[PDB]
Nucleic acid binder design. Structure first.
Ligand SMILES: CN[C@@H]1[C@@H](O)[C@@H](O[C@@H]2[C@@H](O)[C@H](O[C@H]3O[C@H]([C@@H](C)O)[C@@H](O)[C@H](O)[C@H]3N)[C@@H](N)C[C@H]2N)OC[C@]1(C)O
Ligand SMILES: CN[C@@H]1[C@@H](O)[C@@H](O[C@@H]2[C@@H](O)[C@H](O[C@H]3O[C@H]([C@@H](C)O)[C@@H](O)[C@H](O)[C@H]3N)[C@@H](N)C[C@H]2N)OC[C@]1(C)O
Ligand SMILES: CN[C@@H]1[C@@H](O)[C@@H](O[C@@H]2[C@@H](O)[C@H](O[C@H]3O[C@H]([C@@H](C)O)[C@@H](O)[C@H](O)[C@H]3N)[C@@H](N)C[C@H]2N)OC[C@]1(C)O
Ligand SMILES: CN[C@@H]1[C@@H](O)[C@@H](O[C@@H]2[C@@H](O)[C@H](O[C@H]3O[C@H]([C@@H](C)O)[C@@H](O)[C@H](O)[C@H]3N)[C@@H](N)C[C@H]2N)OC[C@]1(C)O
Ligand SMILES: CN[C@@H]1[C@@H](O)[C@@H](O[C@@H]2[C@@H](O)[C@H](O[C@H]3O[C@H]([C@@H](C)O)[C@@H](O)[C@H](O)[C@H]3N)[C@@H](N)C[C@H]2N)OC[C@]1(C)O
Lengths: 185, 148, 155
RNA sequence: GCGAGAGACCGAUAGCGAACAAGUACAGUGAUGGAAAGAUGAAAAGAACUUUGAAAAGAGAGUGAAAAAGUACGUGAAAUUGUUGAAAGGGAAGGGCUUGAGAUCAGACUUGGUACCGGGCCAG
RNA sequence: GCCUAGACCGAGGACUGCGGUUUUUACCUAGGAUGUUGGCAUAAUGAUCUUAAGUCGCCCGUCUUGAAACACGGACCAAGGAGUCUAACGUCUAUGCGAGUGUUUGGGUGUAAAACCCGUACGCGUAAUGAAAGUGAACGAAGGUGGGGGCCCAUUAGGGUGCACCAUCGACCGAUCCUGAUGUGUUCGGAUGGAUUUGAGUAAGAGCAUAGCUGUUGGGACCCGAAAGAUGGUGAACUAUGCCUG
RNA sequence: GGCGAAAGACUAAUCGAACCAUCUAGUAGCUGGUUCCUGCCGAAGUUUCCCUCAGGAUAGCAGAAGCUCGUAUCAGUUUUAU
RNA sequence: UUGCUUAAUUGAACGUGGACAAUUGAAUGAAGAGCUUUUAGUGGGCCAUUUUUGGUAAGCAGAACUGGCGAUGCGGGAUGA
RNA sequence: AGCGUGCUACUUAUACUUCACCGUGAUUGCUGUUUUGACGCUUUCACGAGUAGGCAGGCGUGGAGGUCAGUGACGAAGCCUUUGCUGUAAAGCUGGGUCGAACGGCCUCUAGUGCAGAUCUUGGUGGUAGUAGCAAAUAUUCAAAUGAGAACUUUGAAGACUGA
């Protein structure tokens, strides 16, 4: 017998491979597994774990967020790295000349990057031209902007969005939401 | 497909995952939204506040077309300019020749004031406009023209 | 049926280098050459023989003598023998040339073996008669009588 | 209703109740209720003839690729039953573990190498 | 320190290590068993079946605090036999495209219910808030402070830049309360500045579509089960009562 | 509905409301059942509300999926102080 | 810094700049810490030591802390949750 | 061989120690030798009870797309069998017998997909068991004929009964 101090046979709870069956994603995973195993550069381990992430854990990165990342002091010449899709933003007034490494580019994002003389490259090309991730800047998208996140943790006085199918005066604005109808939580 | 369901895995186990004590029965607790004020109050008052009662005035024979007025913000306004001539218009527009943007013809009813415009004069045609939206258009040398 | 793959090679690996260097047996302190023995097993179980020599294959060289017992020059294993207290001086017995290959495998007995049996038994019988009743003791078989306790017995 | 073409459908306890002389046989005063039941063989070639028996049948014979296909008919499971052989048995039987006994199965003298070399198994 | 009696085990499979003896780039008991001998291969050896012996072993399923129960179902066997499909949804995951997205109502076309092609609308998303009339999102590098992986400069320590995410103080939009300029259809307008208030908001978009498991609601709704209630019909060949004729 | 010298009797072995088909797979907080193997984790009979007391919702306890990080600050325990 | 506070240059709260660096200010431990979504069953309990109420009492009824049984075989108490 | 007490040895749990093997969780390393398996190989350590329940990896069934230019009248499928083999297991393969027309492996798709129970449904079959029983209504007998066969048919002869 053992007086166990912790729960037995616990899986780590972190994803160790992509759930995706895409062969080319698995080729990228192979490359960065070698890189993380043989280089002790933290960038490669970060890139390795990022390739495993699910779709909601890889929010799209807009070119406007990229350009704001490029306006950091000393970051104008960095290689912007997105493990995910780079989308276009028509609210952007101007976009600079930059090198962006991403899994995917939407058509507008790629056109905008190339028109300003930039380079829209894949992650294997990035690995070839920066095997340690030299002069890179990792940009991540907004995880909590998802519509599903509005409804997480709903409860009295929590100020969250109710799960509801129609919006209007007759849909959940009465008793419990109004002091004139009893109480307001 | 049926071969992936837990019904296949529950074969050979007596209760099919429904318990021996509870004994999955027909409608314990009622049907539908039964008892929302009595034995399901603890659910409705927590997750659906506002459910019971009346608020506001009735509107007999509401016609939704009366209220059609899609909004467009200033930061998206230049997407309505012809894409082949957008770059030319930015460099060449002035008080004598400014692009005309027909927001109503593109499916919009009111121009709102979120964001920043290019420092380029524009003639904006709209049914309605917000106060701040017109000020920002007039500040880049443009004008708002009311249409119907 | 699951077909074999290419990576299921049939290479037989070599063994690792074993560190088991064999080193000499140490016999019991009671197995001194010339000691009278009791055979515990085999064709000649119960016979009382004379221990002559320690061969290099760990076995013991014994002789009846063949004229006394009917058991010749042959090998026995030390774990199947009882070493007694009775000792015969065999210091003058010529047992130089008896080795493993002497009892090498090749019924009728080779003439050389008969000659050597005569030669060794000569000196053996010479020394044996010096001890009274020793010859008749060697001629008689050994057995356990009723009430004999081998844990309490001196041999 | 009439005429057609199809199916990731069912395959004789399924599919319509009905694949068959099925809304039949049968029940109820009546309104109504309502089954079971597909397959010898390519071809009856459905066994002439002899013999025992009152006969049904049996035994020979014969036909057939097959009678281990004989209109009790394709295959022909189990419950249950007979005979034969082996075994066991003092108020149940059955089960696990272990070994003995009896029976069965299996293997390296290898795809062995040229009388020797060398190997397999059990043991000191 | 030394001598001495037994038992069980032999995982691994070129070398690589640590030590030891030093006589020496050698040897060792030091990163897990070898040497030798006999017998057998018409066989000891192993496995299963039956049976004997020793020892232990109550009848499963179920409800239950508690079943071997003097609780319930079960004589036996075969075949059938119970979480399904659909509408609309929550989470998660995969995929395509992405400020968009969805060809399939329809049209074109066809090797004809397929595959292939086409677009207007529409749906959902891109803006919220108020009962409503209505109004409607940048003071500032889209702000300040404290953390923050990674990157950069260094040289351990140190400095810089810091996306996601977190705590905190502000700013913007709608509702509410107050203030109330220039002006006027003189009762409208609402500049401007305030308020321990309030919203399912803003603050460099994230969504749409298809599919899958699980969960939800309506449906026969996992399967079998009432006592009842209703609509439309059939019976006085039994029997109850009146009548007519015997 | 009938019929009843009245028993709730009789009305085709059916009567404190016949028989037949249909609505109808009527509803059941109740009883019974609920079909292959191995592996890992693993409860509750407690809180609040309910014409609630053989039932639900709610929290707790459990599983699954992970995600952000990598020794930060944590503990069914002691010590010192209060 | 402030529109708060003081008679005040007094304070309050949050800061700039400078000083203290591994004994960063008790022990022991730490299959690491933190965060989120979603959903099952359950919502009859019972027993033992100690505390304890009603009752003459009860294998009675009702509370407290803990450990158990339920959900669990195994060795022992012959037998037994 | 009782009671109180002290002592020495000894007995044996699924517990403890060391070792083997299985699984689970973690962990070392692996590309100019990564080389046709990197969802792989490999180093090391710890752990293993479980109802209700959750999840994972697998076994089996009907039918569908693809493939094995798969099996088969020189015997498919089914069935019977101390012929054996593999797997912890669900199960898979094989020897012999029976038999007569179709069927299987692999990658996927799909569902009316797995039974010991439901006083389950339909069909079939047992023990009970050659058992309970075949007893109301007065009652039968001899001979002949027929016939393979006569308590039971026919005829004759009797004895009876119903008793208008
Ligand atoms: C001779 N008796 C007749 C006869 O026609 C009988 O036929 C069965 C026949 O149906 C069977 O044949 C059967 O074949 C298969 C299979 C299970 O055998 C059945 O599925 C199928 O229903 C049936 N045709 C046959 N094997 C025996 C005859 N006595 O069916 C009716 C009956 C009155 O019993
Ligand atoms: C900066 N503080 C402001 C506070 O001053 C206030 O602003 C009011 C604003 O509500 C009024 O505006 C109000 O009334 C006008 C109407 C009169 O035209 C409406 O159009 C508007 O929707 C309504 N909010 C505005 N007219 C004056 C501001 N000071 O609004 C709340 C606030 C954000 O806290
Ligand atoms: C008019 N007085 C204001 C006071 O009301 C407050 O302003 C609130 C502001 O804090 C709220 O904002 C709050 O809630 C929003 C959320 C609702 O979107 C958050 O984004 C925000 O971080 C949070 N501070 C904002 N929603 C309304 C203002 N009137 O801020 C202080 C103040 C200036 O005194
Ligand atoms: C980089 N600029 C950021 C700008 O992007 C934005 O950041 C928001 C931040 O304010 C939000 O956070 C805000 O709203 C959340 C919400 C849950 O109520 C609250 O934590 C709180 O009210 C407030 N901090 C955060 N949830 C998302 C960021 N992108 O807000 C302004 C800013 C801080 O300057
Ligand atoms: C000093 N106060 C004591 C308090 O310490 C405690 O004493 C327990 C005593 O009750 C326990 O004893 C108890 O439990 C044992 C057994 C089941 O363990 C029983 O044999 C006994 O009858 C029972 N009284 C004893 N074993 C330990 C003391 N500390 O409870 C009794 C008490 C009087 O309150």
């Amino acid at each position: 017998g053992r007086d166990h101090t912790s729960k037995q046979h616990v899986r780590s709870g972190h994803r160790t491979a992509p759930k995706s069956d895409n062969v080319y994603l698995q080729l990228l995973v192979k490359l960065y597994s070698f890189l993380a195993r043989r280089t002790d550069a933290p960038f490669n381990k970060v890139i390795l774990k990022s390739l495993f992430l699910s779709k909601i854990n890889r929010p799209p990165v807009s070119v406007s967020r990229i350009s704001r990342a490029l306006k950091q002091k000393g970051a104008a010449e960095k290689t912007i790295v997105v493990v995910g899709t780079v989308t276009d933003d028509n609210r952007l007034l101007e976009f600079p000349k930059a090198t962006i490494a991403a899994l995917r580019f939407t058509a507008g994002a790629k056109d905008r990057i190339l028109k300003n003389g930039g380079e829209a490259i894949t992650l294997d090309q990035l690995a070839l031209r920066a095997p340690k991730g030299q002069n890179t800047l990792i940009v991540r998208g907004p995880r909590n902007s998802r519509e599903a996140v509005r409804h997480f943790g709903f409860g009295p006085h929590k100020g969250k969005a109710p799960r509801i199918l129609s919006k209007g005066r007759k849909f959940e604005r009465a008793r419990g939401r109004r002091r004139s109808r009893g109480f307001k939580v | 497909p049926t071969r992936l369901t837990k019904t296949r895995k529950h074969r050979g186990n007596v209760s099919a995952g429904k318990g021996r004590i509870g004994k999955h029965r027909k409608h314990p607790g009622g049907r539908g939204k039964a008892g929302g004020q009595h034995h399901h109050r603890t659910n409705l008052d927590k997750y659906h506040p506002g459910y019971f009662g009346k608020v506001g005035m009735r509107y007999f024979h509401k016609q939704q077309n009366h209220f059609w007025r899609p909004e467009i913000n200033l930061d998206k306004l230049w997407t309505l300019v012809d894409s082949e001539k957008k770059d030319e218009y930015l460099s060449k527009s002035s008080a004598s020749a400014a692009p005309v943007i027909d927001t109503l013809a593109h499916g919009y009813g009111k121009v709102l004031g979120k964001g920043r415009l290019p420092e380029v004069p524009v003639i904006v045609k709209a049914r309605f406009v917000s106060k701040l939206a017109e000020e920002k258009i007039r500040a880049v040398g443009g004008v708002v023209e009311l249409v119907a | 049926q699951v077909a074999p793959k290419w990576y299921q090679s049939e290479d037989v690996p070599a063994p690792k280098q074993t560190r088991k260097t064999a080193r000499p047996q140490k016999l019991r302190a009671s197995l001194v050459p010339g000691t009278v023995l009791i055979l515990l097993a085999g064709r000649f179980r119960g016979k009382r023989v004379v221990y002559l020599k320690n061969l290099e294959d760990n076995t013991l060289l014994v002789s009846g003598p063949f004229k006394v017992n009917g058991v010749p020059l042959r090998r026995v294993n030390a774990r199947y023998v009882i070493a007694t207290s009775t000792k015969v001086n065999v210091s003058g017995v010529d047992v130089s040339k008896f080795n493993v290959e002497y009892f090498a495998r090749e019924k009728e007995i080779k003439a050389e073996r008969v000659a050597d049996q005569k030669s060794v038994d000569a000196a053996l019988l010479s020394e044996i008669k010096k001890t009274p009743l020793l010859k008749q003791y060697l001629a008689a078989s050994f057995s356990l009588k009723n009430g004999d306790r081998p844990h309490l017995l001196k041999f």
